[PDB]
């Protein structure tokens with residue numbers, strides 16, 4: 001009999017965010033070799049039939065991770081390091097530390113992940129790059145540069161770097177910056193509203209449905225991503241797999257997605273460096289930076305093929321049962 005997989009995701013059901021997206025995608029990819037279901041917490045009325053658990057976020061799902069560990073000591077637990085666990089919490093957070101100890105396998109979502117784990121956790125760490133469907137690379141206009149950044153506004157997304165680069169470029173009518181994401185963390189949507197009132201090339205569109213978000217990523221000349229940390233951001237692969245090049249903060253989660261040799265990084269929180277890269281992208285339109293970055297992004301794009309992710313998850317499942 002095939003395994004009965006439970007995926008634990010701290011996301012609300014139907015949420016438009018990474019943690020829901022990963023859990024739903026993994027359920028789809030694994031369905032040909034197992035019975036798969038997604039929950040927010042474990043156990044539940046259906047818990048007795050589950051044989052394997054993949055739990056997202058070593059802190060946020062720590063109570064379900066421990067429930068599983070105590071019910072199945074030494075068997076069937078994979079803990080998936082989705083971001084603030086790996087790059088924040090495992091530091092000093094006893095829940096995140098326990099989850100790391102209890103897991104039979106740890107999953108990181110790009111090549112650099114295990115560098116952030118304790119050395120005693122590296123032998124059971126597995127890399128599972130995420131995947132996304134491709135979109136046709138669109139030909140685009142040289143008349144203007146249109147940038148997009150995508151992320152629900154929270155401090156970890158360092159939206160202030162974008163706000164500050166948009167402000168440096170306030171008078172540049174030839175450069176447009178669209179920003180997609182809900183107004184989560186206290187007062188970030190107010191900063192975005194004030195900036196869009198002052199600097200008409202900058203627009204904060206609020207949260208948009210995923211279909212519309214993918215279409216805007218495809219249509220933009222460039223995707224800007226400023227975060228302090230990422231587990232392995234969906235929006236970077238969504239751009240890459242649309243033929244939209246990226247400007248990203250030099251933090252491990254981003255470097256793991258775009259490569260050690262990528263020419264499109266700026267130092268974390270350096271608004272001037274980001275504004276300089278946008279000016280260089282614009283200058284090149286008409287040898288140009290956008291073309292250089294498109295070439296580099298096209299070599300990354302096969303990392304994000306769902307067949308690749310499926311094969312990595314099939315291997316992981318066979319290890320856990």
Ligand SMILES: CC(=O)N[C@H]1[C@@H](OP(=O)(O)OP(=O)(O)OC[C@H]2O[C@@H](n3ccc(=O)[nH]c3=O)[C@H](O)[C@@H]2O)O[C@H](CO)[C@H](O)[C@@H]1O
Pocket residue numbers: 016017018019020021022081082083084109150151152156157180181182206207208209210211213214227229230231232233234235236238253
């Ligand atoms: C560490 C961190 O800070 N973020 C992590 C978190 O995802 P996040 O939710 O922080 O970021 P993400 O970019 O991985 O995923 C956001 C998803 O929502 C979509 N979107 C977003 C806003 C909006 O208005 N419309 C829209 O469609 C976007 O297109 C993407 O598919 O979990 C993921 C795994 O599950 C990854 O590990 C991320 O790196």
